[PDB]
A paper describes a structure:
Attempts to grow crystals of a complex of V2 with fH67 were unsuccessful. Although crystals grown from a mixture of these proteins did diffract, these were found to contain only the C-terminal barrel of the V2 [name]. This agreed with the observation that V2 [name] is prone to cleavage to a smaller fragment consistent with the C-terminal barrel alone (not shown). The structure of the V2 [name] C-terminal barrel is highly conserved with respect to both V1 and V3 [name] even though it shares under 65% sequence identity with the V1 protein. To further examine the apparent instability of the N-terminal β barrel of V2 [name], differential scanning calorimetry (DSC) was performed on all three variant fHbps. The DSC profiles show independent unfolding of the two barrels with the peak representing unfolding of the C-terminal barrel melting at temperatures above 80°C in all three variants. The much reduced melting point in V2 [name] suggests that the tendency of this barrel to be cleaved is due to unfolding of the N-terminal barrel, giving access to protease recognition sites within the N-terminal portion. The instability of V2 [name] and its susceptibility to proteolysis are not desirable in a vaccine antigen, and might explain why it has not been included in any vaccines in clinical trials to date. Such instability is less likely to present an issue in the context of the protein on the exterior of bacteria where interactions with surrounding molecules are likely to stabilise the structure, rendering it competent for binding fH; however it might explain why more C-terminal residues appear to be critical for fH binding compared with [name] from other variant families. Overall, comparing the amino acids in V1, V2 and V3 fHbps that reduce affinity to fH by over 90%, V2 [name] is more dependent on contacts within the C-terminal barrel and less susceptible to alteration by mutation within the N-terminal barrel than V1 and V3, where residues critical for high affinity fH binding are spread across the surface of both barrels.
Factor H binding protein ([name]) is a 27 kDa surface lipoprotein consisting of two β-barrels that promotes resistance against complement mediated lysis and is a key meningococcal antigen that elicits SBAs. We have shown previously that fH CCP 6 and 7 (fH67) are necessary for high affinity interactions with V1 [name], and that these two CCPs are sufficient to inhibit binding of full length fH to [name]. Here we characterised members of the three variant families by identifying amino acids that are critical for fH binding and through structural analysis, to inform future vaccine design and to understand the basis of the interaction of [name] with fH. Here we show that even though V1, 2 and V3 fHbps exhibit remarkably conserved atomic structures, differences in key amino acids necessary for interactions with fH are only revealed by functional studies.
Residue numbers in the entry:
A (entry chain B): 201 to 211, 213 to 320
B (entry chain A): 200 to 211, 213 to 325
Amino acid sequence: GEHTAFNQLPSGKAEYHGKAFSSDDPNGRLHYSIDFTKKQGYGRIEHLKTPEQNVELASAELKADEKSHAVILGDTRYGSEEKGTYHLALFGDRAQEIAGSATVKIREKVHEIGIAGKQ
Amino acid sequence: GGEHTAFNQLPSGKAEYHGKAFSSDDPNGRLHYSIDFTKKQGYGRIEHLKTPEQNVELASAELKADEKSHAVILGDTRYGSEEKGTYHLALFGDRAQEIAGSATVKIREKVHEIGIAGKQLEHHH
């Protein structure tokens, strides 16, 4: 439901699975891990038909945005090279859900990928 | 080519963006978005998604620099004037030719993620 407030973050670690969908491919999958104690998250997009869109969602810090909402802003990578960025927001009293998006630049073309996951 | 617009490379005037709005179950929506570069404000709307409540207003929000000096917009999503969530956009190209990001819409305690992307259709001063 509501955005998880940064100063209301649950304790420990969480694992998320869900969908990754581009404008022409609704069939990708998201895997994402959050360590609430270390304030860190990372994951990956998989199963999109374009191999280069199956990016690593590189290790990034869990921080507050200007509305005090718990967010993660990180880099997207493919073969260890930076391809763009991703933005995730946490939802629920226990950060049960994550949603946001990722960009992947392929041959000077930017691809926008919607991402969503649940514990 | 395809790089983030640096906040100090922003054009002036106003630009209109048209493009796609796509949820995990509906790839056929449309984005309309206006950026007033002089006032550093943007707003728009999502339309043509089959679920009426997903056709949100992307409320007026500030155009600012992110931590990498990239031009971005973070604002609220609304439907019937009520807040439904938030949206984020990033600007791409040396003249902010494109925008891409996403919007969240909460419907009956369920959060819906909508991918959004647009290209400059019109620019005036």
